[PDB]
């Protein structure tokens with residue numbers, strides 16, 4: 001790689017943003033960053049900021065439940081949000097994981113049925129990955145050009161890839177793979 | 182008035198964009214937003230060609246070849262975004278690319294060649310004054326001048342924004358009722 005620079009050039013700006021977001025949304029969250037010394041193409045560093053911030057915001061908004069709710073639910077009172085970078089072969093892997101309520105998969109199914117994309121019989125045969133992928137279909141999720149869409153497009157314009165996994169009341173993990181320059 | 186989703190106009194673009202990019206050997210990720218945005222049905226036939234021209238301009242003149250994108254420290258794949266939405270009592274349509282931007286120096290040279298401006302007045306022209314030459318009838322060698330004419334024909338307005346090596350954004354606002 002030619003113009004390598006530590007991912008910290010983009011990471012160090014998140015602790016402040018996370019705390020303020022958590023305060024505004026009345027959420028209690030412990031933010032952990034890992035692999036801040038991971039080197040990657042400077043172009044990626046300058047472009048991956050917007051996408052990551054959105055995933056972080058998603059986690060704080062839709063993921064982590066208010067402290068009172070986590071308590072009522074029987075989970076540790078403070079939520080955990082982890083942002084990490086690491087090497088996997090010739091790929092830099094960035095992950096945003098929260099231990100929140102998890103993506104509501106039924107909600108997605110209901111929305112897909114409403115849009116006429118699938119019917120009830122078919123909906124019952126879909127796999128979790130199949131359900132979660134609806135989140136990447138442009139125009140699927142209602143807006144207010146932000147969203148999972150913009151995240152995937154930006155990541156893919158860097159020749160990157162993005163995947164999602166989630167478990168009810170367990171949390172959600174978004175994974176971004178960036179290529180070695 | 183009688184409305185229809187703007188998808189009637191947008192539907193054919195993905196294929197044309199894909200084929201054009203492939204022809205001019207450019208890597209382009211085409212994004213279309215708000216295809217459900219409605220507009221006057223009598224606008225469909227008229228606004229199609231102008232929009233296609235703006236998309237072609239972005240692919241041909243905007244988005245740079247891969248090696249150029251890399252040299253400039255930009256994402257390898259260029260991004261072309263076509264969007265429509267309702268604002269106030271109008272339909273707003275935008276065509277944006279993150280390419281090399283409009284060659285303003287080239288526009289001024291053309292304006293002088295066409296007798297539209299004396300060279301003694303070129304040094305102080307504002308960016309808007311420069312880009313506006315594109316709307317002067319006969320400026321193009323369908324061209325931007327024709328696009329502006331058609332938009333005016335629909336009682337709407339058009340504006341351009343562009344920054345060197347950053348990109349170009351063309352915004353069209355058409356009246357609803």
Ligand SMILES: Nc1ncnc2c1ncn2[C@@H]1O[C@H](COP(=O)(O)OP(=O)(O)CP(=O)(O)O)[C@@H](O)[C@H]1O
Pocket residue numbers: 058059060062063064098100101102103104135141142143144145146147148149172
């Ligand atoms: N970390 C997370 N935990 C739980 N659900 C999540 C999540 N991240 C995303 N989601 C779910 O996925 C759906 C869409 O996220 P997306 O980022 O595309 O849209 P948005 O609903 O957040 C509105 P916008 O992106 O325009 O602010 C969300 O509305 C939510 O239901």
Ligand SMILES: Nc1ncnc2c1ncn2[C@@H]1O[C@H](COP(=O)(O)OP(=O)(O)CP(=O)(O)O)[C@@H](O)[C@H]1O
Pocket residue numbers: 238239240242243244278280281282283284287315320321322323324325326349
């Ligand atoms: N998205 C964009 N990015 C960069 N330059 C653009 C552009 N859209 C237009 N231009 C530039 O502005 C000048 C004029 O565009 P206009 O559409 O009026 O004419 P045209 O001469 O390009 C017709 P054609 O090239 O289709 O034969 C172009 O010649 C090009 O240099």
Ligand SMILES: [Mn+2]
Pocket residue numbers: 054058146147148
């Ligand atoms: Mn969101």
Ligand SMILES: [Mn+2]
Pocket residue numbers: 238323324325
């Ligand atoms: Mn042209």
